Design a protein around this ligand. Structure first.
Ligand SMILES: Nc1ncnc2c1ncn2[C@@H]1O[C@H](COP(=O)(O)OP(=O)(O)OP(=O)(O)O)[C@@H](O)[C@H]1O
Ligand SMILES: Nc1ncnc2c1ncn2[C@@H]1O[C@H](COP(=O)(O)OP(=O)(O)O)[C@@H](O)[C@H]1O
Ligand SMILES: Nc1ncnc2c1ncn2[C@@H]1O[C@H](COP(=O)(O)OP(=O)(O)O)[C@@H](O)[C@H]1O
Ligand SMILES: Nc1ncnc2c1ncn2[C@@H]1O[C@H](COP(=O)(O)OP(=O)(O)O)[C@@H](O)[C@H]1O
Ligand SMILES: [Mg+2]
Lengths: 1543, 281, 97
């Protein structure tokens, strides 16, 4: 327990000390200590490696003492390194925004400054890189992402300050002082531009170009504030001529100059500066107009103090404190943080109210809480206010993983740096986390309040707060802001104490008209006012008139996207007119171009490009009428993107897809593809919404390929099923102990793209989320899908979204996504009408004609496609059949692609049948006429079995009759036999299925055996259908009532496929994909082929069929998703999954899935997802009818009664007595009364098996004894589970009635003596026993039991004798498990132990205590399995319902009851020990087994034969219903005995 | 020592603080203990077998939810904190919470400003009972809003009055106070145009120079033809004494609402009372 | 054309704001006006004694809370609610006055 820790510590410390070759210069003494440690480590490696034996090294003295000394040294040096990192973070606090490994990277790479250029983006607001000279010895300045640079007035020399922290601090200080000096110069110039009647455009543009985008806006604000203050000071006399009009006119003329400037072409940086200046001066004009209208003549009037005012004092020695920003009574000093070129917001009344409220909160030294619906600009407003004060604002997208420690360290970083923390979705945290974080917030605010006191002096002790058990310095510039959407899903409730720490503000209705007007005016739109007054009411009326859809969003974000697209479209149209003028003539006048420009047409084009793609069919005319009314007389026609259209044509031809233009076949699909392309061009977050199989996947794949072939940029798509894995595996985990971050799947992909080791940034990267969307996982992408384009992790790491990456979602609905997600994504709606059925038929036929199925095979496929072409047309046989089948009743929801894929697979099987016929007859290959007849008849047959295979008999007959009415294919001519009763022979003729159903004679010793099937019409039909579906490896689902024969049919069909090995998985309510992963680990292996990781079965040449027993049992979350179902859908549709150990795509090979389930209407069963049912054909296996049951059990009875010739004539009546009573009970007792009242042929199978066991030893027996055995087995089958007394009385009376009806001439008393008791205790055979002799024998055995075992005296009554007889019956059967349901203290455990002792079973009970966990249960399970499977010891495992502490108990018990083994129970050294003991046990038995697979099979057989599980539980009404879903095997694999209370 | 419940470190801190205080005699407060219903049981068992210092006190602040253990409720004395029953009770609580030295300061008008603040707070908090009509939704107009308004009044009065004993009512920054209360303090919670209009209603009606006249009416036609009269006093004790002599006949007309607004509610509660008197029979 | 002269109950419609938008659109299209420059005027009259012009739409079931309407003028009342017999919504050009 010491060697591994020391080894790991030495490895990572050696990595740290070796990667950082310069770390020794700052850490000398510990460098020498680590050199000594490394010498010691080399000594150990030279000593222990010589002798590779544990015994050879544990005999050497001085090893453990030296190891303990080394452990202490490693701990001490690690603590010293941690303290050093803390101390170096104390200086230059920006290092609190980088990780420890990153901090060490900067520490050791101080000599080379090239590696440090990637860390400034996370330590500074807008500093992306630092400018250095050719020597890389002095820091000349800083640069931003946009390329704007600030040249330091005095460059920082790294040579004079070699230490990293010192020159970094000098760089930051020089940044601030240089920004202050440049601001002073810009203010000096803009003052000259101020107080002027006219402004020269050239000088104004020169000044704009000279200074940074931040500084020009700041200087304009300062100059305007000074002008207004001077005017108010002059007017303070009262009743005087106003020079405030002069200030207003100065604003107006400057706005005119700026508006003229933006009309003409400008450099992008200058254009952004002009836009910011236009916005700011529009706000200034509005404020000045408000002041003039209000007749404000005093500078101390609140109409002027309520505004943001800027005061510049050149007389201040400190240039940092030279600028003051004041709002109401709140004063701030400009932080002078370089912000680069941010996007300025429009200062709307709401923004002003937000500024006032947040500044009031800041003056009170408490946080701000803007709340409201999504898209009200709560976050942006906080960031805009932070940038207005020159603050460094960091946005943290918060979720429930932001625990106390993560929030504490974020607060520590904010305190040290002095930054603003905008915590978006703060309510996504847990309520207990919110309460815990409230204490830290209160401590920080108290520290700030103490700082604000005038009694404090900066020369005294600095203000510190207790954060994470540490004293942390709190800067006065810190602020905490929390933006939350009240009412949304996935949000928690804030505690009152936390709420009192923030000033709340309702941001619900943004001033959309003002934003639109200002944005359009800044882009150069003439008549922006009318455009805004038309486009904002248009959005309001679109929200009102249009239908309510979950993917509809007509909020600010939608308008914002529309306005940005309108500006881009205007620029593109101007460029197009420019090139047209260049190619035709030489006269270009940009003013003329702006004058005659159809701005309303541009707005219509923007709206159509952004709003139209998300509209449903019924809402398109409404929106177009709204456009025609709001913008009358103007029309827009979408441009024909031809250059992309030929590429789409080529890709569709290469991908066997149908292409169309406009109103042709597939035209709507191409329109949707073009809309998706436009949304990609305009949005970095996209979503493709529509019902399953609407062509979304093909749309985006074809778009990606066409873009690759058109632009030349290679497109890489990463497809992730977000709900197929846990959110921890999707985003990442933070270790609560070691604070170590493990990346998730999306995080790993994004980080790999950002690093771009293999040129990832040069490729078009599309991360598609193909799965269900709920607020639990998708809200973590909010900051990703927002302007922030940033992924924030709880460990403080922030990853910026590269411009070449698009985040896409492919979903079937958005009924669980909140508006927060809907508003942050461009929606493309794919209706089912987009993908027509003709398109699917064309794709299938093209694939059949092109792709070989195994060239003679391709020729056969082409001939078959030519033959079946006439039936796959619009208004054809298949289309009308599908339309009619959609009107029938099916056991599951009917989707078009499920039936179509079933039909296509059956047609592929037909082609393979023709190929097999040709191979079998080399001399006489199948001719065109025989092929035509066979293909037509098989097409009819496959249509029938694919469009009605999941329906009852009457639906199948109805579909057959409809097909017969509409088809022209020659059909069977029977007047009454339905078409579903025929098959198609390879000769091309209809043949009845009854010819494949021969009356067999089962062997006497094989009566009612588990693998014995009596051939019946449904058996031969379902067997053929399952063989057809399995031969193609197409996943299939069998639906039907429990015990209908789904497992029996599937095993019978698989017996005809020797190359397939079946593995049973039993799903339950808490089944999760880890069960599938354990099955893969046990039965398959991963290998790293050159194409990637491939998971394939260990047995080469065999296909692994994973048979799921109850596929619809797994619980749906509160958002209607089953994780295991999504996992299977991913493995089927994508042919693989993701290994979360290293986030690696694993491709499945030679693995197929088969599912079984009860109808979804049954209790505890959920309907399957439509995206899952699309790929799995569903076959409905119903209960055998009276004729089929009579045939199946009649055969078993004849085989049974062949034992006694004198009874051979009673097979026909007995079977009838079997059939009638079973029917009656099935009608009498249903699941409506009690959950366990389920009766199926399985009960009758047990009936025949029990009577056969009773009849095996007897040499002869009269009819009365046979009837007695029949009645006894009926009692043990149909009466033991009954709850009420009247039900059991009904069972007795009708057993007598049925027996007398079917056996008239019998002795009633001799066969129906009411105490019907059978036992093999008194005699060797299972003959009937008398009650009194049985009581005496039980009394004697109980005396012996008291002497040898538990000595609790018992009182014998009749019920005790009946119960012990039943338990003895169950313990004498293979895989015989019990479920005794009754009141506590009724003797269930005592009777079970007594009967187990009589039968030689060893009683095992788990000793559960308070500290009992799942691991203890697993260990006990391993013990019992080893004892009963390796030592051949019969064990009665007695378990009580109170012994269960978790659902994992029920999962493991369910798997053990159903299969006899737990796939993941023995893993690791335990599996090797189990294999060793199993080999020893097999050698003891006399079987020589070599491989682990067959040995594990022998172990499973031993466990099945030996272990008997007795489950005892109290009779709860809802408890039994819950157990029926949590553990299905407790009700299908266990014999249920209702002891109840004592009568 | 105040500790917020919810984290493991929180539980460790709570245990350490209680163990220290039961010997030293200090006080321990634990906040939001309803978020850890399980831990409250072990806390109750720990408290039961304990003989702490004479001056030791343990306060557990919680929300009224059924997850709190019954045994813990029986083990301690319960105090329910809720909106005051009426305008008079609300104003009395407001005047008791604010220190006397705060109201009695350099300007004599500060007392009347605080009285107006208390009346305003009482009216808006009492209109919350008639949720559909008094407002549009259950806004959380609470004690923090009152503190913020008091701080704003203090700051702006001190700014306007540079320590002068008396200032004219017209010189009081009424516009600043009205705007800050309608946009930042009380208007921050308001997310409706009509609720904002009603808040502006109350602020313009109450906060003005006319509030310093002897004929000022706080409310009109409360019952019949009489109306609530603005007290003529200039000291805090006189305002409190006026609040004490309120008629104890409060009607929704005191709030500006119609008198029948309570008619349904006062009916239901009455019936509810009967039900409770029948449940305990 | 008959659908214009019917009186609907706004509370009995699944989406009454869609009805308001539809009436606004009908008035805008009839007079060839722009959709965004239309404002709404309300005239309360008796259901039987009323006339609807090209811009007026009839609405029933509106209840005035705490006030009574006489001659299209509102007065405070002590009644909980007063049933407005018929309401004429008439779309007109915005005057900005
Ligand atoms: N342009 C096309 N021409 C012909 N067939 C097409 C075309 N586009 C798609 N298909 C076919 O129609 C079906 C559409 O499946 P696709 O995966 O594209 O739909 P989807 O809506 O993304 O499905 P899901 O919602 O299940 O993920 C497939 O059989 C596909 O091969
Ligand atoms: N005053 C404004 N001027 C311009 N754009 C604005 C303004 N307010 C908000 N926006 C835009 O509206 C959207 C609001 O985004 P965000 O702040 O994330 O919203 P919320 O906080 O409501 O979730 C962004 O596109 C933002 O740029
Ligand atoms: N033709 C048949 N031959 C033999 N047994 C049959 C036949 N049809 C139905 N059965 C009986 O039906 C039952 C089906 O059990 P099982 O395969 O577990 O059903 P399910 O898969 O529906 O749960 C068994 O008892 C089986 O013997
Ligand atoms: N038939 C009986 N006569 C007398 N005592 C009995 C009888 N059955 C159970 N007990 C007593 O009940 C206790 C055992 O109950 P147990 O079998 O564990 O109950 P459960 O039915 O809940 O499993 C012992 O005290 C035992 O002597
Ligand atoms: Mg798809």
């Amino acid at each position: 327990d010491v060697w591994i820790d020391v080894q790991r510590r030495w490895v990572y410390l050696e990595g740290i000390f070796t990667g950082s070759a310069d770390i020794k210069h700052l850490l000398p003494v510990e460098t020498q200590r680590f050199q000594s440690i490394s010498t010691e480590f080399l000594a150990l490696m030279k000593k222990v490696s010589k002798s590779p034996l544990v015994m050879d090294v544990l005999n050497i003295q001085g090893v453990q003492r030296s190891l303990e000394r080394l452990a202490d040294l490693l701990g001490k040096i690690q603590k010293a390194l941690g303290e050093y990192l803390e101390r170096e973070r104390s200086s230059f606090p920006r290092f609190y925004f980088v990780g420890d490994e990153d901090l060490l990277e900067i520490i050791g790479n101080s000599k080379n400054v090239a590696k440090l250029q990637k860390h400034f983006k996370k330590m500074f607001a807008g500093v992306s890189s630092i400018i250095l000279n050719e020597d890389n010895s002095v820091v000349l300045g800083i640069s931003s992402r946009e390329g704007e640079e600030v040249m330091f007035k005095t460059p920082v020399s790294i040579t004079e300050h070699p230490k990293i922290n010192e020159w970094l601090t000098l760089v930051e200080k020089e940044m601030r002082v240089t920004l202050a000096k440049l601001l002073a110069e810009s203010v000096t110039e803009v003052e000259i531009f101020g107080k002027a009647t006219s402004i020269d455009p050239n000088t104004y543009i020169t000044w704009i170009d000279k200074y940074q985008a931040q500084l020009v806006v700041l200087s304009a604000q300062i100059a305007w504030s000074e002008n207004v203050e001077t005017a108010l000071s002059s007017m303070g006399g009262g009743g005087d001529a106003a020079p405030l009009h002069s200030v207003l006119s100065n604003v107006e003329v400057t706005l005119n100059v700026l508006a003229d400037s933006v009309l003409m072409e400008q450099p992008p940086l200058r254009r952004r500066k002009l836009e910011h200046l236009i916005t700011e001066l529009v706000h200034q004009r509005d404020v000045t107009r408000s002041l003039i209208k209000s007749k404000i003549d005093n500078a101390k009037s609140f109409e002027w103090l309520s505004q943001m005012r800027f005061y510049f004092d050149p007389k201040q020695t400190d240039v940092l404190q030279q600028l003051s920003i004041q709002m109401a009574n709140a004063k701030f000093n400009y932080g002078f943080e370089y912000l680069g070129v941010q996007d300025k917001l429009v200062q709307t009344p709401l923004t002003d109210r937000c500024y006032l409220t947040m500044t009031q909160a800041l003056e009170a030294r408490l946080g701000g809480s803007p709340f409201g619906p999504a898209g009200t600009g709560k976050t942006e407003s906080v960031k805009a206010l932070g940038h207005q004060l020159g603050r460094f604002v960091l946005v943290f997208n918060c979720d429930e993983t932001f625990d106390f420690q993560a929030m504490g360290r974020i607060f520590v970083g904010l305190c040290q740096v002095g930054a603003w923390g905008c915590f978006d979705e703060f309510n996504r945290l847990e309520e207990r986390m919110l309460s815990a974080v409230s204490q830290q917030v209160q401590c920080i605010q108290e520290a700030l309040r103490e700082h604000s006191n005038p009694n404090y002096d900066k020369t005294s002790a600095p203000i510190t707060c207790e954060l994470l058990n540490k004293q942390v310095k709190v800067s006065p510039d810190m602020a905490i802001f929390i933006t939350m959407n009240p009412g949304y899903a996935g949000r928690s409730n804030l505690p009152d104490n936390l709420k009192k720490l923030f000033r709340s503000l309702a941001m619900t209705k943004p001033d959309r008209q003002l934003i639109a007007q200002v944005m359009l005016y800044s882009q150069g739109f003439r008549t922006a006012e009318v455009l805004a007054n038309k486009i904002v009411p248009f959005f309001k009326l679109c929200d009102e008139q249009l239908s309510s859809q979950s993917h509809y969003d007509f909020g600010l974000r939608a308008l914002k996207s529309v306005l940005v697209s309108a500006g881009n479209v205007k620029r593109e149209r101007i460029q197009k007119i420019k090139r047209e003028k260049e190619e035709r003539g030489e006269a270009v006048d940009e003013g003329e171009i702006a004058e005659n420009l159809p701005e309303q047409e541009i707005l219509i084009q923007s709206v159509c490009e952004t709003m139209v793609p998300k509209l449903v069919a019924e809402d398109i005319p409404l929106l177009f009428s709204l456009l025609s009314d709001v913008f009358p007389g103007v029309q827009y026609h979408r441009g024909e993107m031809t250059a992309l259209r030929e590429e789409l044509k080529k890709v569709c031809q290469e991908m066997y897809l149908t292409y169309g233009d406009g109103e042709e076949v597939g035209g709507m699909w191409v329109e949707k593809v073009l809309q998706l392309y436009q949304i990609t061009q305009i949005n970095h977050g996209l979503m493709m919404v529509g019902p399953s199989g609407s062509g979304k996947s093909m749309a985006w794949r074809v778009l990606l390929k066409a873009l690759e072939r058109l632009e030349g940029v290679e497109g890489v798509a990463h497809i992730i099923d977000p709900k197929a894995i846990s959110k921890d595996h999707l985003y990442g985990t933070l270790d609560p102990n070691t604070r170590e971050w493990t990346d998730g799947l999306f995080t790993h992909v994004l980080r790999k793209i950002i690093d771009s080791v293999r040129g990832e940034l040069q490729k078009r990267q599309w991360i598609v989320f193909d799965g269900d969307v709920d607020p639990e996982w998708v809200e973590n992408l909010n900051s990703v899908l927002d302007d922030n384009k940033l992924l924030t992790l709880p460990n403080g790491e922030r990853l910026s979204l590269p411009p070449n990456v698009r985040i896409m979602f492919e979903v079937q609905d958005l009924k669980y996504a909140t508006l927060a997600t809907v508003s942050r994504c461009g929606m493309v709606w794919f209706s089912e009408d987009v993908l027509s059925t003709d398109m699917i038929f064309n794709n299938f036929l093209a694939r059949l004609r092109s792709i070989p199925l195994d060239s003679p095979m391709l020729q056969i496929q082409r001939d078959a496609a030519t033959i079946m072409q006439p039936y796959f047309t619009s208004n054809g046989l298949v289309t009308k059949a599908l339309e009619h089948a959609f009107q029938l009743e099916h056991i599951m929801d009917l989707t078009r692609l499920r039936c179509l894929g079933s039909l296509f697979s059956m047609l592929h099987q037909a082609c393979r049948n023709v190929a097999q016929y040709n191979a079998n007859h080399p001399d006489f290959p199948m001719q065109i006429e025989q092929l035509e007849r066979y293909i037509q008849r098989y097409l009819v047959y496959a249509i029938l079995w694919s469009l009605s295979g999941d329906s009852r008999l009457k639906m199948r007959a109805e579909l057959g009759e409809y097909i017969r009415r509409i088809t022209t294919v020659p059909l069977p001519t029977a007047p009454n036999i339905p078409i579903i009763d025929y098959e198609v022979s390879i000769s091309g003729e209809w043949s009845p299925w009854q010819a494949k159903v021969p009356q067999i004679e089962v062997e006497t010793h094989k009566v009612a055996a588990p693998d014995v099937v009596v051939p019946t019409l449904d058996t031969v039909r379902h067997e053929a259908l399952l063989y057809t579906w399995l031969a193609e490896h197409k996943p299939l689902v069998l639906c039907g009532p429990p015990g209908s024969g789904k497992t029996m049919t599937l095993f019978s069909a698989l017996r005809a496929l020797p190359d397939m090995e079946v593995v049973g998985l039993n799903f339950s309510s808490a089944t999760t994909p880890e069960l599938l992963l354990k099955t893969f680990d046990h039965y398959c292996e991963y290998r790293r082929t050159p194409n990637g990781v491939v998971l394939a079965p260990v047995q080469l040449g065999k296909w692994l069929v994973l048979f799921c027993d109850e596929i619809n049992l797994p619980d749906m979350d509160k958002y209607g998703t089953q994780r295991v179902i999504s996992f299977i859908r991913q493995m089927v549709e994508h042919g693989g999954f993701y290994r979360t150990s290293d986030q690696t795509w694993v491709k499945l090979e030679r693995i197929q899935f088969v599912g079984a389930c009860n109808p979804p209407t049954d209790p505890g069963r959920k309907p399957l997802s439509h995206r899952f049912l699309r790929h799995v054909p569903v076959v409905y296996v119903d209960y055998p009818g009276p004729a089929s049951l009579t045939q199946i059990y009649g055969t078993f009875n004849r085989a049974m009664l062949r034992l006694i010739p004198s009874l051979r004539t009673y097979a026909e009546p007995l079977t009838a007595a079997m059939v009638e009573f079973y029917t009656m009970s099935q009608e009498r007792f249903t699941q409506d009364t009690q959950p366990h009242y389920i009766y199926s042929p399985r009960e009758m199978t047990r009936w025949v098996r029990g009577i056969f066991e009773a009849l095996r030893p007897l040499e002869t027996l009269p009819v009365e004894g046979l009837i007695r055995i029949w009645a006894h087995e009926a009692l043990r089958l149909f009466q033991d589970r009954l709850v009420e007394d009247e039900e059991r009385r009904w069972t007795d009376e009708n057993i007598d009635t049925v027996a007398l009806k079917h056996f008239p001439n019998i002795d009633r008393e001799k066969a129906m003596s009411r105490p019907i008791l059978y036992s093999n205790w008194l005699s060797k055979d299972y003959i009937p026993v008398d009650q009194e002799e049985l009581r005496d024998y039980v009394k004697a055995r109980l005396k012996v039991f008291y002497e040898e075992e538990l000595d609790v005296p018992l009182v014998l009554f009749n019920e005790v004798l009946d119960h012990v007889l039943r338990i003895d019956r169950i313990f004498r059967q293979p895989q015989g498990h019990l479920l005794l349901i009754g009141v506590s203290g009724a003797g269930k455990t005592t009777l079970s132990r007594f009967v187990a002792w009589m039968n030689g079973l060893s009683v095992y009970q788990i000793k559960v205590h308070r500290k009992y966990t799942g691991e203890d249960f697993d260990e006990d399970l391993r013990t019992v399995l080893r004892r009963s499977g390796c030592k051949n010891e019969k064990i009665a495992f007695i378990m009580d319902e109170s012994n269960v502490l978790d659902s994992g108990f029920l999962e493991r018990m369910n798997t053990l009851l159903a299969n006899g083994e737990v796939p993941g129970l023995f893993e690791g050294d335990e599996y090797a020990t189990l294999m060793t003991q199993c080999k020893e046990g097999a050698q003891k038995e006399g079987l020589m087994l070599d491989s682990h697979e067959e040995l594990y099979k022998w172990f499973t057989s031993q466990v099945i034969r030996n272990l008997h599980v007795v489950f005892t539980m109290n009779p709860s009404s809802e408890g039994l219903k819950d157990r029926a879903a949590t553990s299905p095997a407790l009700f299908n694999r266990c014999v249920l005995n209702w002891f109840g209370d004592w009568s | 020592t105040s500790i917020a419940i919810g984290s493991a470190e929180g539980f460790n801190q709570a245990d350490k603080a209680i163990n220290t205080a039961v010997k030293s005699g200090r006080w321990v407060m634990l906040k939001n203990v309803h978020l850890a219903p399980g831990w409250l049981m072990q806390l109750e068992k720990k408290l039961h077998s304990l003989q702490p210092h004479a001056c030791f006190r343990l306060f557990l602040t919680m929300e009224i939810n059924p997850k709190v253990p019954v045994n813990l409720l029986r083990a301690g004395r319960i105090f329910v904190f809720e909106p005051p029953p009426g305008v008079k009770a609300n104003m009395l609580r407001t005047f008791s919470s604010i220190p006397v030295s705060r109201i009695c300061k350099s300007p004599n008008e500060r007392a009347r400003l605080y009285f107006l603040l208390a009346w305003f707070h009482a009216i808006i908090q009492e209109r919350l009972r008639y949720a559909p009509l008094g407002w549009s939704k259950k806004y959380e107009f609470g004690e923090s809003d009152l503190r913020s308004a008091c701080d704003t009044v203090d700051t702006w009065l001190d700014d306007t009055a540079k320590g002068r004993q008396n200032i004219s009512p017209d010189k009081i920054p009424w516009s600043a106070l009205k705007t800050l209360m309608a946009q930042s303090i009380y208007g921050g919670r308001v997310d409706n145009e009509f609720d904002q209009r009603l808040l502006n209603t109350f602020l313009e009606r109450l906060f003005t120079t006319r509030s310093f006249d002897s004929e000022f009416k706080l409310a009109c036609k409360v019952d019949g033809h009489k109306d609530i009269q603005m007290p003529d006093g200039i000291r805090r004790e006189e305002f409190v004494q006026w609040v004490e002599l309120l008629p104890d006949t409060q009607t929704p007309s005191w709030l500006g609402l119609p008198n029948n607004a309570e008619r349904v509610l006062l009916t239901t509660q009455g019936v509810d009372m009967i039900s409770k008197m029948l449940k305990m029979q | 054309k008959e659908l214009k002269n019917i009186h609907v109950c706004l509370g009995g419609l699944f989406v009454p704001e869609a009805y308001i938008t539809a009436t606004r659109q009908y008035v805008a299209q009839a007079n060839s006006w722009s959709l965004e420059e239309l404002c709404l005027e309300v005239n309360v009259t008796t259901s039987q004694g009323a006339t609807l012009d090209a811009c007026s739409f009839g609405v029933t079931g509106l209840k005035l809370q705490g006030a009574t309407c006489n001659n299209n003028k509102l007065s405070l009342s002590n009644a909980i609610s007063t049933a407005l017999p018929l309401t004429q919504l008439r779309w007109v050009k915005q005057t900005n006055t």
